[PDB]
Amino acid sequence: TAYTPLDVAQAYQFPEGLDGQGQCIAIIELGGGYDESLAQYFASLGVPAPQVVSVSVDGASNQPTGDPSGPDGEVELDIEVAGALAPGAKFAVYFAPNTDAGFLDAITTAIHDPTLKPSVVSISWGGPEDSWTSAAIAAMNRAFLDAAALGVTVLAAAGDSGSTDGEQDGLYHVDFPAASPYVLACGGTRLVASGGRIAQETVWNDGPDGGATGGGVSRIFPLPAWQEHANVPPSANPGASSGRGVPDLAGNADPATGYEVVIDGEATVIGGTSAVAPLFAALVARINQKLGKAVGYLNPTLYQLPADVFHDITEGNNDIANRAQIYQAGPGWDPCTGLGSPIGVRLLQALLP
Numbered sequence: 034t035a036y037t038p039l040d041v042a043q044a045y046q047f048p049e050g051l052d053g054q055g056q057c058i059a060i061i062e063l064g065g066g067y068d069e070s071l072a073q074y075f076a077s078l079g080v081p082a083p084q085v086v087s088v089s090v091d092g093a094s095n096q097p098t099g100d101p102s103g104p105d106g107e108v109e110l111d112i113e114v115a116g117a118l119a120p121g122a123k124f125a126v127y128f129a130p131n132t133d134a135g136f137l138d139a140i141t142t143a144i145h146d147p148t149l150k151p152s153v154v155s156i157s158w159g160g161p162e163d164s165w166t167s168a169a170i171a172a173m174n175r176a177f178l179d180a181a182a183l184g185v186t187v188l189a190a191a192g193d194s195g196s197t198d199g200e201q202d203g204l205y206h207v208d209f210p211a212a213s214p215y216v217l218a219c220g221g222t223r224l225v226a227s228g229g230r231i232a233q234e235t236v237w238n239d240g241p242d243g244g245a246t247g248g249g250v251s252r253i254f255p256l257p258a259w260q261e262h263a264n265v266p267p268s269a270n271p272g273a274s275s276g277r278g279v280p281d282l283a284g285n286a287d288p289a290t291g292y293e294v295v296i297d298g299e300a301t302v303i304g305g306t307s308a309v310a311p312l313f314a315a316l317v318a319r320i321n322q323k324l325g326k327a328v329g330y331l332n333p334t335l336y337q338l339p340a341d342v343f344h345d346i347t348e349g350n351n352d353i354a355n356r357a358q359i360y361q362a363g364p365g366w367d368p369c370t371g372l373g374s375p376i377g378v379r380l381l382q383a384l385l386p
């Protein structure tokens with residue numbers, strides 16, 4: 034199976050009549066490029082190609098490498114998914130070197146950008162939280178904090194290597210920046226839909242060889258107040274305390290039921306949690322447009338909303354390391370899919386004045 038991004042937005046009942054006009058979505062990139070074949074693809078979808086402007090950071094810039102398996106794959110997937118679904122939005126793509134500094138610097142640049150003022154920041158890059166310097170973590174978090182104060186929604190993909198996050202030391206790890214309490218962490222599912230109805234939605238897990246959604250409990254960031262009613266367990270690692278549970282929301286990421294994109298001029302099908310942050314970023318822009326105001330930092334509200342605002346995933350696990358089924362999805366918040374997939378019209382309604 035394959036879907037267009039529009040197929041997936043209908044399953045998730047995105048609000049109609051809204052295309053993100055008046056909103057600017059920042060997308061962070063740590064490599065590659067795109068070619069402005071993007072218009073071609075949006076044409077093929079029957080939607081207008083939005084305005085896309087690239088921004089140089091720390092000397093880096095829009096430079097496609099030709100390899101659909103390199104960063105170009107991340108960049109164009111990111112732009113195609115949010116752009117297809119928020120085509121009235123303006124797209125600001127910040128290119129920075131793939132490092133500690135560049136990543137921080139691209140995020141700080143976007144958030145504070147006085148020309149383009151994105152109201153949403155989508156991120157599809159990261160690494161095990163335990164892999165980041167102390168200083169990069171703190172800096173990254175204060176950047177997110179600054180985003181919340183400016184009414185900017187920051188969304189991050191939770192990872193494509195299951196509960197172990199590609200670390201082969203035998204322990205469970207969560208990815209950063211999705212582990213930041215100030216980020217909307219986006220995990221992944223396997224979606225079977227049609228007629229705009231969800232027939233089946235389960236944890237994305239294609240074992241060691243095909244990826245799984247990241248998800249779990251942070252051993253660096255404390256359980257936030259607003260997560261206290263979400264039955265987050267302690268980290269499964271020995272001795273581990275209470276910590277921020279990852280993720281908050283989840284959506285179609287299984288490449289087996291993936292997104293029809295064009296990458297480096299080739300038609301192909303792709304998944305990963307990489308696509309879910311751009312997906313919900315478009316959701317949030319349509320909502321800001323309807324409301325006339327940026328919703329900014331959403332995690333405290335989301336965990337206070339009625340549960341029926343979300344489609345709950347309750348089956349499956351994100352373990353690709355062993356047979357212990359860590360972690361398992363369940364009724365309500367769980368460490369594979371968080372609150373579940375958002376029901377667009379219901380999320381907008383809950384937030385209307």
Ligand SMILES: [Ca+2]
Pocket residue numbers: 345346347362363364365366367370371372373
């Ligand atoms: Ca659940």
